[PDB]
Amino acid sequence: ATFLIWPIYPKIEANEKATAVWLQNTGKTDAMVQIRVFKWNQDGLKDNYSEQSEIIPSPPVAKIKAGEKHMLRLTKSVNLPDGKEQSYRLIVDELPISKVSFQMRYSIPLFAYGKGIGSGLTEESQKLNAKNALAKPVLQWSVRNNQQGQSELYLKNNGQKFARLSALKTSKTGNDISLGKAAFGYVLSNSTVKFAIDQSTAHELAKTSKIYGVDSSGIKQELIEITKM
């Protein structure tokens, strides 16, 4: 079954009570889906999801006939803490209705804001963040070796907002270093994460002091300075 999800990067602003995500079955076959929102954190340098009641998705289950477009209402139950950015995933679970078969699950990030900080994707929130010195990602990096000998990169976000990283460069004009295996990208606000990096990159890295990440968290792709711990 085939789905058009829009917007892929939804946010609920501080002064909005809800936002919508649209879900369209573009296949030729009826589909059934479950809708859930989990609170999202990076404690213990791994990504963790917990059930949650700050955001309520409506409907929790839906029959989506072929070609139909449904409106997911994501509702903010209570106002969120001042000046903070809260992190979730909307999870869309396609319910089924010698082989081995596939059940799909689609997950988009969701971000909701408290008073005095915002996504930065509208002029109202742009003007709100200019007045906040930490309404942005503020990254630091350091590479450290495990007792087993695996090399792993630590990224620590001091800012009140997340960073979505597509690549790491060693200089503002350089090329992307070859982050080999292991996905990476999100460093949530006020967190630190830990990617496994191959030996090719430790050295290349840490032969330099500042590096630069490509960040899509705002309006356009943009370099950000990551400094060393």
């Binding site: 079954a1 085939t2 789905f3 058009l4 999800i5 829009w6 917007p7 892929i8 990067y9 649209w22 573009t26 296949g27 995933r89 089924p96 010698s98 082989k99 081995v100 078969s101 596939f102 059940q103 799909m104 699950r105 689609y106 997950s107 988009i108 990030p109 994707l121 509208t122 002029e123 979505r164 597509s166 292991a182 996905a183 990476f184 990208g185 899509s216 309006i219 356009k220 792709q221």
Partner: protein, 129 residues
């Protein structure tokens, strides 16, 4: 205008191995790379990074079941045909979309005391943006 709210069309838009009864004595191949295969298409000018993770089956060990019995046979799925890149259980692999082209999410499959008719399992494929 303002900024571009990106939206994506996520897959699909099964893995039939054949027979695992009795003896084979070599590795069995099945591919979805069948009713069509899985692919992500986004719509910005920018590329969109995303992530695909595959679970360990209904038993967490990527093992089929005969249905009639406790007969079980293990397997694994891979991103490349050559099977050098394991979809390690619940560990995400990075993908990217190029503007105006679909990105395939390929899944290549593989697999003696003979066991003898029809075995099954179901995999959870998570696509994360």
């Amino acid at each position: 205008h303002h900024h571009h709210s990106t939206g994506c069309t996520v897959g699909g838009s099964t893995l039939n191995f054949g027979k695992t009864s009795g003896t084979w004595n070599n590795v069995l191949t099945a591919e979805v790379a069948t009713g069509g295969n899985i692919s992500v298409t986004c719509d910005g000018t920018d590329p969109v990074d995303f992530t695909v993770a595959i679970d360990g089956g209904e038993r967490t060990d990527r093992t089929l079941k005969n249905t009639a019995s406790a007969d079980v046979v293990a397997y694994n799925v891979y991103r490349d045909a050559a099977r050098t890149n394991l979809y390690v259980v619940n560990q995400p692999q990075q993908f990217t979309t190029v503007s105006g082209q679909a990105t395939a999410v390929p899944i290549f499959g593989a697999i003696n005391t003979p066991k003898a008719g029809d075995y099954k399992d179901t995999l959870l494929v998570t696509v994360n943006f």
